[PDB]
Amino acid sequence: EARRTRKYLELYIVADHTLFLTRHRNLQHTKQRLLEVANYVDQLLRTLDIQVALTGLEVWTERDRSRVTQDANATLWAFLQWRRGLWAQRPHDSAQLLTGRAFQGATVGLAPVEGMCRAESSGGVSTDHSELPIGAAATMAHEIGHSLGLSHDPDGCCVEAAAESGGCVMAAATGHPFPRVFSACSRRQLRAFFRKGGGACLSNAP
Ligand SMILES: *[C@@H]1O[C@H](CO)[C@@H](O[C@@H]2O[C@H](CO)[C@@H](O)[C@H](O)[C@H]2NC(C)=O)[C@H](O)[C@H]1NC(C)=O
Ligand SMILES: [Ca+2]
Ligand SMILES: [Cl-]
Ligand SMILES: [Cl-]
Ligand SMILES: [Zn+2]
């Protein structure tokens, strides 16, 4: 056999003010939640041969630094414009906002398609919708997938996980049991993405 070259996603994760309020204004426990969610994101992405490197953690304890509203899309781009300033001081590949608020329209997470590594769109927003950390992580990993140009899984894609096991990450539907692996279809799409020049910033080992 042969060894595949690993990829690394330098991740910066942010907890908005509402999530902080939800965690009873406990800074330590809010940070712990972000770390646990990142941990599950790492587990999921590893099935794509991508390892997570947590660049930074940030909790908006007194005020949101970017406007977070019921509008997932508005919230996303407001966060992405804020991410630019942050990137200059603390470089990272992708910034992810975890919010305690719910979005209008049944939306649970959102990110720009194929924006991985781009200064203007390499990030995403996810709601911490489940008591379980893996819930938000699955949502965040799904959006990172979209960021990497991955589409939702077609008809018979995802054989490496059944219903009770949570299925695959790029499934069109979300809910418990949550997914822990990306389908083979997703893995092929990712290798094509890299080969074609996408996600150039995931090459350096932190
Ligand atoms: C999500 O929100 C952004 C920002 O409001 C939308 O982007 C704007 O799109 C319009 C029309 O395409 C342009 O005139 C603006 O210049 C864009 N603003 C930018 C680039 O920041 C985007 O279309 C929205 N996505 C939706 C609702 O699907
Ligand atoms: Ca990098
Ligand atoms: Cl290839
Ligand atoms: Cl080629
Ligand atoms: Zn999707």
Arch. (CATH architecture) of 1-206? 3-Layer(aba) Sandwich (3.40)
123, 78 Cβ separation under 8 angstroms:
no
Q: How far is the CA of 48 from the centre of ligand 2 (A)?
A: 16
**Going by C-beta distance under 8 Å and a sequence separation of 6 or more, which residues neighbour residue 141?**
40, 41, 44, 45, 169, 182
In 10 A of CB 114, how many CB atoms?
16
Give the span between the Cα atoms of 160 and 183, in whole angstroms: 7
Using alpha carbons, list the distances in angstroms from residue 20 to 23, 34, 86, 97, 161. Answer: 5, 11, 20, 12, 34
Nearest of 32, 2, 5 to residue 203 by alpha carbon: 5
Q: E-assigned strands of 41-93?
A: 50-59
Residue 180 backbone dihedrals phi, psi, to 5 degrees: -120, 0
Using the atom order of ligand 1, give the atom closest to the CA of residue 74: 2
Helix axes 27-46, 133-147, angle to 10 degrees: 50
> Maximum distance among all alpha carbons in the chain?
53
Q: Is cis: bond before 206, omega within 30 of 0?
A: no
Resolution in A: 1.9
Q: E-assigned strands of 60-176?
A: 94-99, 109-110, 123-127
Pocket lining: 55 vs ligand 1, CB cutoff 6 Å: no
Residue environment code for 128-153, b if the CB has 16+ CB neighbours within 10 A, otherwise e: bbbebbbbbbbbbbbbbbbbbbbebb
Pocket lining: 107 vs ligand 1, CB cutoff 6 Å: no
Which residues line the annotated binding site for Zn(2+)?
Answer: 142, 146, 152
Q: How far is the CA of 86 from the centre of ligand 5 (A)?
A: 26
